[PDB]
């Protein structure tokens with residue numbers, strides 16, 4: 166709806182640091198780096214053929230790092246100690262961070278590409294505090310009235 | 319107006335928004351301008367899909 | 372102060388890889404975006420991509436994707452940077468100057484601009500210049516600087532002393548990849564056919580000088 | 588979808604004048620002026636806002652979708668190219684130069700030596716010098732016959748002193764088709780010249 170007539174396509178991140186090409190998050194002390202490259206390609210033309218498939222589960226490789234500069238230049242260099250025992254994480258996928266790609270100066274082929282990842286850490290919060298504005302109340306008001314303070318003679 | 323906000327988690331993630339909230343309306347698309355590619359594009363879901371890693 | 376500077380000219384063979392750099396240190400560079408612009412000769416500008424110094428995230432248009440690559444290399448103090456491109460598998464008609472610019476605000480205004488690097492790619496690899504005379508029958512007189520590659524070559528007459536009404540046409544390139552430009556100087560009408568001139572050139576890429584004694 | 592247009596881009600003006608250029612767009616416009624083979628400089632951004640360290644002669648008229656960039660008291664240094672820039676699309680631009688400096692061209696033909704033919708190559712040039720306006724037709728003919736797709740034409744920059752131009756027409760020929768016709772003509776018709784002119788030459 167937000168784009169007139171262009172088919173949509175997806176591609177994995179085109180490069181950059183490991184904090185952008187990868188899906189970075191935390192579990193109980195250690196940090197994960199999952200590829201998530203099978204979830205960010207497709208195309209959609211006219212939905213003429215419904216590619217019905219079986220209930221296939223998707224398995225994503227996930228490298229694990231220990232020395233993370235999770236903030237670019239203001240966070241201290243880290244070293245998470247290894248955590249004992251099997252660790253399992255169950256969570257919610259509520260939002261996805263996207264990024265468009267520029268068009269051509271000659272002739273668009275009625276398509277646009279979207280890429281995941283990117284964005285500074287602020288966007289992870291701007292998508293949640295989006296419904297809160299802070300104001301101060303000015304509790305003094307002025308208005309006409311037909312009472313004149315009856316001053317004592 | 320409310321006295322003050324509900325809960326918010328300080329969870330940090332880069333490519334996806336792990337364990338956040340949901341909007342009851344529909345799939346929302348938020349940006350500064352969608353016509354400007356520089357700004358990020360934030361999509362919001364109404365049916366959270368469980369992750370298990 | 373901003374001193375956004377770009378490296379010198381680089382020439383490569385077809386199908387090879389090229390690298391052009393650009394640096395920025397004179398302000399808080401950890402927060403403004405950087406953009407690359409290429410301009411085909413005798414043609415308008417053309418976007419190449421935008422890279423964020425914060426994370427190194429690239430972005431490319433449809434046609435240049437895959438072939439191009441954008442990368443940054445920070446310093447330890449986050450004060451001096453160095454941005455590098457790499458255009459793998461260079462094509463034929465991609466000889467153009469490449470510009471690095473800076474983004475000031477969300478209005479997509481660019482204030483600081485780089486010096487610009489001339490990049491040319493073609494076959495018919497490096498060789499010296501050969502000058503073929505033209506014999507005249509006001510008037511003119513030319514010293515055709517044929518069959519040389521690559522650009523540029525100095526041009527002067529009579530050790531630069533006699534430059535009466537010079538007209539050095541810009542170097543037009545033929546199919547062979549050997550540059551050729553015509554340089555003429557205004558000369559009287561009836562006095563020609565007996566006077567003698569000399570043309571001297573130098574080709575810095577090949578470092579060879581040939582002095583030609585043009586005669587009627 | 589952002590569409591771009593431009594003024595007819597073939598404009599000229601005299602010293603100490605005012606000129607108007609037009610851009611149609613539906614976004615943010617930043618005016619850039621560029622020299623010949625030099626990095627373009629930002630001139631006016633947001634249509635009307637004027638950048639720090641810019642001569643006051645410039646102006647910006649944000650009206651509807653139309654856009655204006657009027658320069659006052661046109662000086663010789665103002666001779667450059669101008670274009671309006673939006674997020675991604677960039678217009679071809681505009682060409683600005685001095686006007687009305689009429690001068691008649693002169694076809695100049697110089698037969699070469701036989702030395703290059705020993706290397707199996709022939710090269711002769713038709714020259715058009717000291718003329719304005721630029722537009723004209725320059726062609727070769729073999730004993731007054733059609734010749735096309737075999738010459739490479741170059742034009743120098745605008746002539747600084749007389750505000751004129753100069754066009755070169757270099758022709759490449761094979762062995763047989765060169766000396767088969769001893770004399771050639773290079774007819775050129777141009778606004779500066781009153782009547783079309785033809786030339787002749789001889790080798791000796």
Ligand SMILES: *[C@@H]1O[C@H](CO)[C@@H](O[C@@H]2O[C@H](CO)[C@@H](O[C@@H]3O[C@H](CO[C@H]4O[C@H](CO)[C@@H](O)[C@H](O)[C@@H]4O)[C@@H](O)[C@H](O[C@H]4O[C@H](CO)[C@@H](O)[C@H](O)[C@@H]4O[C@H]4O[C@H](CO)[C@@H](O)[C@H](O)[C@@H]4O)[C@@H]3O)[C@H](O)[C@H]2NC(C)=O)[C@H](O)[C@H]1NC(C)=O
Pocket residue numbers: 190191192193194253254255256257329336337
């Ligand atoms: C989105 O939301 C989900 C759901 O809430 C969330 O997943 C939850 O994550 C938290 C933390 O990451 C999990 O909490 C941990 O759970 C384990 C599970 O252990 C079970 O099994 C053992 C036996 O093996 C039982 O003993 C135990 O009772 C459980 O049944 C706990 O073992 C963890 O306990 C540690 O932390 C507690 C915090 O109070 C301590 O009290 C406890 O002693 C343990 O502390 C140890 O480690 C500390 C360092 O972490 C150390 O300081 C201590 O000294 C000590 O050594 C812990 O409670 C929770 O189970 C997850 N939910 C589910 C359903 O599994 C996601 O994390 C969230 N999204 C994102 C992105 O985070």
Ligand SMILES: *[C@@H]1O[C@H](CO)[C@@H](O[C@@H]2O[C@H](CO)[C@@H](O[C@@H]3O[C@H](CO)[C@@H](O)[C@H](O[C@H]4O[C@H](CO)[C@@H](O)[C@H](O)[C@@H]4O)[C@@H]3O)[C@H](O)[C@H]2NC(C)=O)[C@H](O)[C@H]1NC(C)=O
Pocket residue numbers: 350351353613614615649650651652
């Ligand atoms: C980024 O997003 C913002 C929205 O947050 C977007 O702002 C839009 O700008 C355009 C033009 O820049 C606005 O279009 C105007 O809409 C008003 C509505 O009444 C019209 O009246 C306007 O026409 C008059 O405007 C001139 C202003 O001086 C008049 O002088 C003149 O007479 C015109 O007739 C004009 O059409 C638009 O309203 C806003 N808001 C939106 C679209 O919600 C901004 O343009 C975006 N940046 C881009 C696309 O680059």
Ligand SMILES: *[C@@H]1O[C@H](CO)[C@@H](O[C@@H]2O[C@H](CO)[C@@H](O)[C@H](O)[C@H]2NC(C)=O)[C@H](O)[C@H]1NC(C)=O
Pocket residue numbers: 200202
């Ligand atoms: C995530 O998976 C993608 C799958 O496409 C990997 O991309 C491949 O990377 C290798 C690197 O050795 C290349 O040789 C391949 O050409 C890439 N594409 C394919 C289709 O294999 C990507 O490398 C993975 N992420 C990481 C961090 O390795």
Ligand SMILES: *[C@@H]1O[C@H](CO)[C@@H](O[C@@H]2O[C@H](CO)[C@@H](O)[C@H](O)[C@H]2NC(C)=O)[C@H](O)[C@H]1NC(C)=O
Pocket residue numbers: 256257337366368
């Ligand atoms: C991840 O999504 C699931 C699906 O909604 C959540 O499951 C329910 O979440 C609500 C939240 O208000 C709870 O009240 C319910 O008890 C949950 N279970 C059921 C069966 O409805 C799940 O809670 C989400 N993850 C987290 C950490 O909240």
Ligand SMILES: *[C@@H]1O[C@H](CO)[C@@H](O[C@@H]2O[C@H](CO)[C@@H](O)[C@H](O)[C@H]2NC(C)=O)[C@H](O)[C@H]1NC(C)=O
Pocket residue numbers: 342343344345346364365
């Ligand atoms: C989540 O949002 C989507 C749209 O963003 C909902 O899908 C639409 O539902 C309405 C309800 O009648 C239909 O009229 C539309 O045709 C649906 N659109 C599409 C593309 O299918 C969806 O129902 C919402 N689901 C939940 C659980 O909130």
Ligand SMILES: *[C@@H]1O[C@H](CO)[C@@H](O[C@@H]2O[C@H](CO)[C@@H](O)[C@H](O)[C@H]2NC(C)=O)[C@H](O)[C@H]1NC(C)=O
Pocket residue numbers: 253255370371
């Ligand atoms: C989350 O993942 C874990 C492990 O990937 C699941 O634990 C498995 O559950 C199945 C079915 O209950 C058992 O057959 C396996 O033996 C369990 N362990 C492993 C290593 O596979 C867990 O059930 C998953 N939970 C959800 C809600 O998806």
Ligand SMILES: *[C@@H]1O[C@H](CO)[C@@H](O)[C@H](O)[C@H]1NC(C)=O
Pocket residue numbers: 169170
């Ligand atoms: C886009 O699609 C609509 C409806 O399907 C159609 O009316 C229109 O002509 C198409 N093209 C453009 C450029 O809007």
Ligand SMILES: *[C@@H]1O[C@H](CO)[C@@H](O)[C@H](O)[C@H]1NC(C)=O
Pocket residue numbers: 202206207
């Ligand atoms: C993802 O989709 C693209 C779209 O054409 C396809 O070329 C590619 O092979 C797919 N897989 C990967 C790993 O990129």
Ligand SMILES: *[C@@H]1O[C@H](CO)[C@@H](O)[C@H](O)[C@H]1NC(C)=O
Pocket residue numbers: 214215216217218221
């Ligand atoms: C996802 O859906 C699309 C469209 O129906 C289809 O082309 C593709 O094969 C599907 N992939 C999986 C894994 O179901």
Ligand SMILES: *[C@@H]1O[C@H](CO)[C@@H](O)[C@H](O)[C@H]1NC(C)=O
Pocket residue numbers: 446447
């Ligand atoms: C430090 O070591 C890294 C390891 O690759 C290297 O890339 C970098 O150039 C070195 N110097 C600085 C100042 O980071």
Ligand SMILES: *[C@@H]1O[C@H](CO)[C@@H](O)[C@H](O)[C@H]1NC(C)=O
Pocket residue numbers: 607609648649650653654655
């Ligand atoms: C921009 O130029 C047009 C061209 O005629 C003219 O009306 C005026 O100078 C400007 N238009 C405006 C400011 O609406």
